[PDB]
Short mmCIF file of C-alpha atoms in Angstrom, two decimals:
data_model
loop_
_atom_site.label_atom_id
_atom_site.label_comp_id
_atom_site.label_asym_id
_atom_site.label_seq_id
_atom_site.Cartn_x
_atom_site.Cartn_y
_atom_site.Cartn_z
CA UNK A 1 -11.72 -0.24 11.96
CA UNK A 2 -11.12 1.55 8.52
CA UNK A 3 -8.34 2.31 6.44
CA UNK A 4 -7.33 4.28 3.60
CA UNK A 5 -3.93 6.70 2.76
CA UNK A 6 -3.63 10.04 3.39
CA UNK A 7 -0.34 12.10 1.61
CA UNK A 8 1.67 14.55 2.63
CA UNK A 9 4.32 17.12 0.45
CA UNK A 10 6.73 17.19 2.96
CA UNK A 11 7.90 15.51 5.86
CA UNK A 12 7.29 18.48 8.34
CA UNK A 13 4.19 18.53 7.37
CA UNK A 14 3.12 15.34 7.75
CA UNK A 15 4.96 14.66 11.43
CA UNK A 16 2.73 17.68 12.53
CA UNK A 17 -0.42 15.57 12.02
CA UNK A 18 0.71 11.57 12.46
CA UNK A 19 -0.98 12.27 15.64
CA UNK A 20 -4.14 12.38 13.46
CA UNK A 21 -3.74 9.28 11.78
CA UNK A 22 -5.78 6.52 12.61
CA UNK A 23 -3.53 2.74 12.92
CA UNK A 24 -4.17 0.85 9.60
CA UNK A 25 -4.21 3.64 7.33
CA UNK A 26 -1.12 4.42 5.00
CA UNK A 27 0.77 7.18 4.60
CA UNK A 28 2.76 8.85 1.91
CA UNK A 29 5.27 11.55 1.67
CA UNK A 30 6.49 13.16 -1.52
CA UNK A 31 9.76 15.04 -0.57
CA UNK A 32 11.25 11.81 -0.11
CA UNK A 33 8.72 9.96 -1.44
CA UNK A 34 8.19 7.46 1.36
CA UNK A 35 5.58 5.22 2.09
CA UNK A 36 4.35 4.38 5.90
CA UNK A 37 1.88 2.40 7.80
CA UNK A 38 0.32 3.60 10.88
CA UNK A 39 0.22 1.16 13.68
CA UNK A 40 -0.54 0.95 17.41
CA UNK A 41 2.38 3.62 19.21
CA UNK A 42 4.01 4.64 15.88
CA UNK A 43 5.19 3.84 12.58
CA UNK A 44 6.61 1.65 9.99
CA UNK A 45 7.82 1.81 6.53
CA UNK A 46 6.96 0.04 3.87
CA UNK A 47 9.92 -1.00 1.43
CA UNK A 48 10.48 0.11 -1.66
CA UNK A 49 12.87 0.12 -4.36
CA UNK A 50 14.33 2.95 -5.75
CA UNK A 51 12.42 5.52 -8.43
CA UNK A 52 12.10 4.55 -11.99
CA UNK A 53 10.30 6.13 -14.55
CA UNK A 54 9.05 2.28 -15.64
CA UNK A 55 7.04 -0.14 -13.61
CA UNK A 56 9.74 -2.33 -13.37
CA UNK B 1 -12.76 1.76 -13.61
CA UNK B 2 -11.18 -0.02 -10.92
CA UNK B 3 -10.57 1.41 -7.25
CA UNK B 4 -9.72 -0.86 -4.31
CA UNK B 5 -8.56 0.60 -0.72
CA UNK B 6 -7.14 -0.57 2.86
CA UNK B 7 -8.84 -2.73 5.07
CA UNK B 8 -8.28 -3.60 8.29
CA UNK B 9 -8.90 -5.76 11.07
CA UNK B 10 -7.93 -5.96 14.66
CA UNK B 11 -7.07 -9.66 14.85
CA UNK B 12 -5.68 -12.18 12.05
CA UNK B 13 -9.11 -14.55 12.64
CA UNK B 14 -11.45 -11.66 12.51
CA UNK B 15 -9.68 -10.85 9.07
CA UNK B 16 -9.80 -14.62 7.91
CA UNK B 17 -13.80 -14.68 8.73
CA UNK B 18 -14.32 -11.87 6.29
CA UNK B 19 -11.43 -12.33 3.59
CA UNK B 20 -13.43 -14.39 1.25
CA UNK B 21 -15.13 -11.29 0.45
CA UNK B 22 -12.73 -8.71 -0.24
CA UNK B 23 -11.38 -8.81 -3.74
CA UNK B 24 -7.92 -9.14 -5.46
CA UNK B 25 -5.87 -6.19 -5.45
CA UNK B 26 -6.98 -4.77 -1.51
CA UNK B 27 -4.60 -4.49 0.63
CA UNK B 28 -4.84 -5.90 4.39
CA UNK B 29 -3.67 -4.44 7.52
CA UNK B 30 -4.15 -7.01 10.53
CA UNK B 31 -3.24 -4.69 13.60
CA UNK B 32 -2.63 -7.37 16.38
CA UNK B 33 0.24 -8.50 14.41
CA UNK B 34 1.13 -5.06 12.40
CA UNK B 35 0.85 -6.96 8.83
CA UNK B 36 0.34 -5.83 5.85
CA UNK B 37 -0.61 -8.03 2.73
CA UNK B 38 -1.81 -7.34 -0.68
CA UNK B 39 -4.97 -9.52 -1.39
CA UNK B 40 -4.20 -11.33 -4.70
CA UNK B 41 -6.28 -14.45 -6.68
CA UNK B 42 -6.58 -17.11 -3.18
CA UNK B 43 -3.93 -15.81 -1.79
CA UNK B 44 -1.76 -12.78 -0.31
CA UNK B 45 1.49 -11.56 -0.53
CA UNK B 46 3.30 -9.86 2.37
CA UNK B 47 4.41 -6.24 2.54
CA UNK B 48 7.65 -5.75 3.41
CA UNK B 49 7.88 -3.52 6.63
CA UNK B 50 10.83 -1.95 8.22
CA UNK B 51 10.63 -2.26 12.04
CA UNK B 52 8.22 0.33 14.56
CA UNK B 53 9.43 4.07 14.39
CA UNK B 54 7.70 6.23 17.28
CA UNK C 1 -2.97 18.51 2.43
CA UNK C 2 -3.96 15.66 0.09
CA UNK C 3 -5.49 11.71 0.09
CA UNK C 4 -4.75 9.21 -2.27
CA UNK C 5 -5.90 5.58 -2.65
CA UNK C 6 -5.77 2.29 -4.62
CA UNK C 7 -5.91 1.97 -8.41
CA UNK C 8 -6.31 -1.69 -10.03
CA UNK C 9 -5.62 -2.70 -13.52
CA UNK C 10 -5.95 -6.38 -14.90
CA UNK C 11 -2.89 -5.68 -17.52
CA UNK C 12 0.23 -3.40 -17.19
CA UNK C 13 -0.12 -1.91 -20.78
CA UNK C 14 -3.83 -1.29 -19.77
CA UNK C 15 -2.19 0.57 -16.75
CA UNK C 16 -0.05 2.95 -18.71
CA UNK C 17 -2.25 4.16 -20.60
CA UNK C 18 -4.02 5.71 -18.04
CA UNK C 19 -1.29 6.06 -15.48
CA UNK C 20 -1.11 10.53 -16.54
CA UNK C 21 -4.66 10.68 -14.81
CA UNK C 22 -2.75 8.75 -11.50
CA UNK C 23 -1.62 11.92 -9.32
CA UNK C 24 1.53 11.45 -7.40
CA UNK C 25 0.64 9.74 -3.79
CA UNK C 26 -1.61 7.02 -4.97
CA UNK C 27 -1.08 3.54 -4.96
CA UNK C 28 -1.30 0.97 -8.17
CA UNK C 29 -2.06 -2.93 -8.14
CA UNK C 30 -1.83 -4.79 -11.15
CA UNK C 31 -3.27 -8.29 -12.27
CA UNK C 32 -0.34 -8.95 -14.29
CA UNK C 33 2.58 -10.17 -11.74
CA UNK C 34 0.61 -8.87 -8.93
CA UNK C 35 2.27 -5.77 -8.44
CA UNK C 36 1.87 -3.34 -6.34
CA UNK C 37 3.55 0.61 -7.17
CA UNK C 38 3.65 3.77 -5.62
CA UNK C 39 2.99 6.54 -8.17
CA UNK C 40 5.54 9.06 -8.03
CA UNK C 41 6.37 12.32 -10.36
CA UNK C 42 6.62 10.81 -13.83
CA UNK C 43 7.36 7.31 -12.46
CA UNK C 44 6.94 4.46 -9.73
CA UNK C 45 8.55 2.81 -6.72
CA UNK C 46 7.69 -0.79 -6.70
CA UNK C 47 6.56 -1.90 -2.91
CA UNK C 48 8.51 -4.79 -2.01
CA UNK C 49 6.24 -7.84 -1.51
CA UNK C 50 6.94 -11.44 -0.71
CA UNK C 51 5.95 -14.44 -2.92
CA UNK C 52 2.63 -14.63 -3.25
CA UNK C 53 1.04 -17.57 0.05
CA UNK C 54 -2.40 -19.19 -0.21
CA UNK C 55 -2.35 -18.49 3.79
CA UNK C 56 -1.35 -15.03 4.98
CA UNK C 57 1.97 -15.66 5.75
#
């Protein structure tokens, strides 16, 4: 298989096309900027901590 | 002037007969077990995943 | 309708200084602590990662 990450602006947006997605690849969502994997039969978040404006 | 990407592998050996060759800063999906690692300097460190949305 | 990707950097100060040409969406790994970052407007969101393993773990 192959991999990569695809983004989406908003979360309606994306859902409409996670169909699409191939497992393994990542996916990102800016309205609430939101980071996902694709794997076999759905979906998983990745954690991450909250916004800063440093690389903390 | 440095890109890396996603791989990924269906099974944790097929993954550990080719990760010699991917470099530091990759990240690794290994399907059977839905993992997730960033490939660092002989070694990896586990993404942290929240459990299987459908 | 957008991709993204993976950006490296050996050094975090090497990093900022190019981070304004890192759109929104991508990811960013640096050599320095082995971090990993989403790039979000003006700013990050550090991917939570374990301790670095010499065996996937």
């Amino acid at each position: 298989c192959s991999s990569g990450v695809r983004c989406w602006a908003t979360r309606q947006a994306m859902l409409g096309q996670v169909h699409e997605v191939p497992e393994g690849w990542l996916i990102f969502v800016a309205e609430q900027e939101e980071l996902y994997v694709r794997v076999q039969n759905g979906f998983r978040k990745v954690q991450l901590e909250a916004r800063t404006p440093l690389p903390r």
